[PDB]
């Protein structure tokens, strides 16, 4: 079996094994980089995904969220407080403050000790979730606004024809915003690609261990576990290194730096935080290995978790019987 300890693999295609984005993605599998729940891609050199980034400053966060953290250091929740509207501009401006900027450290692993240690401390606003690319319409290779969609996935591999929509969605972040622990919707890939600024570390458990994961929230958050019992789609809770090494959870970490994909692979449960001021892309896709765990996903139906639009038809063709619960708690 490749990769039989689940490393996070980089890979460093060339120029022409980046034409193909579906047939690259299958090349890692073969590699065994699905078993690690996360890949990095560092694109050929040859490769761009626009000219200059010297134009974004009016783009506007119409809902800048500040993230309020609950709990311990290592062991919190976090909920997103809605600010008013401001524009990357502005934004980056406001992550630069001496408020909320980047402090002085000597490298990536000191940066990850202050996090962990004074995260809870602060509340950071994340421009989070904004609907849009910054990809030129003019890359023609992993063009994340061009991917084949979910949808067309679905028909090919199942026959159905279904409504929906997928298209990709813009991060600005700043010094500590955080991602909380979870899988993607449905257990869907994702991919990410960081276009500037300052980097993101990641943290990711195993495919083969998520259930691991999921124990210990339940044991940490218990509370939240009998409120729901998928309450990690709520994408609040957040658990440190060291108490995923005390609790025994296989994991790993990664930093991503700008210029840098991200792969997350179905049912890769991950979570991590922003070094400073940076802008990320993202976007959920589907192979064919994908199907058998869209039908496997679990699902919140105590309501919080509120989706996408795009989610019913994946939940009504693959999961007939959870289907009538799951939409009560979106209705
Ligand atoms: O970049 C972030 O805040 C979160 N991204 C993801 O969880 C992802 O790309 O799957
Ligand atoms: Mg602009
Ligand atoms: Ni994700
Ligand atoms: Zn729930």
Redesign the pocket.
């Known amino acids: 079996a490749q990769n039989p300890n689940c490393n996070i693999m980089i890979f460093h295609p060339t120029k022409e094994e980046f034409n193909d984005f579906d047939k690259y993605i299958a090349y890692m599998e073969s590699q065994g980089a699905h078993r690690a729940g996360l890949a990095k891609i560092i694109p050929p050199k040859e490769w761009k995904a626009r000219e200059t980034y010297d134009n974004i400053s009016e783009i506007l966060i119409a809902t800048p969220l500040q993230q309020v953290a609950s709990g311990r250091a290592g062991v919190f929740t976090q909920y997103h407080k809605k600010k008013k509207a401001m524009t990357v501009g502005e934004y980056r401006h406001l992550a630069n403050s001496k408020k909320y900027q980047t402090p002085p450290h000597q490298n990536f692993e000191d940066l990850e000790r202050k996090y962990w240690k004074n995260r809870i401390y602060n509340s950071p606003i994340?421009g989070?979730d904004i609907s849009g690319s910054l990809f030129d319409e003019n890359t023609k290779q992993w063009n994340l606004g061009h991917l084949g969609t979910i949808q067309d996935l679905l028909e090919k591999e199942c026959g159905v024809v279904i409504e929906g929509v997928n298209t990709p969605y813009l991060?600005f972040?700043m010094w500590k915003?955080?991602?909380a622990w979870?899988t993607?919707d449905m257990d869907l890939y994702?991919?990410?690609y960081l276009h500037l600024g300052e980097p993101?570390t990641w943290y990711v458990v195993p495919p083969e261990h998520g259930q691991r994961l999921e124990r210990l929230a339940r044991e940490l958050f218990p509370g939240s576990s009998r409120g729901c019992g998928a309450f990690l789609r709520h994408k609040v809770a957040l658990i440190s290194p060291t108490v995923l090494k005390e609790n025994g959870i296989p994991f790993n970490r990664i930093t991503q730096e700008a210029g840098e994909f991200?792969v997350?692979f179905p049912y890769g449960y991950?979570?991590?935080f922003?070094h400073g001021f940076n802008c990320?892309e993202?976007?959920?896709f589907a192979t064919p290995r994908w199907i058998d765990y869209g039908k496997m996903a679990s699902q919140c139906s105590c309501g919080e978790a509120r989706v996408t639009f795009s989610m019913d038809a994946f939940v009504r063709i693959l999961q007939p019987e959870r289907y009538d619960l799951w939409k009560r708690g979106q209705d």
């Open positions: 994340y989070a991060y972040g915003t955080t991602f979870h993607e994702s991919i990410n993101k991200m997350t991950h979570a991590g922003n990320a993202a976007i959920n």
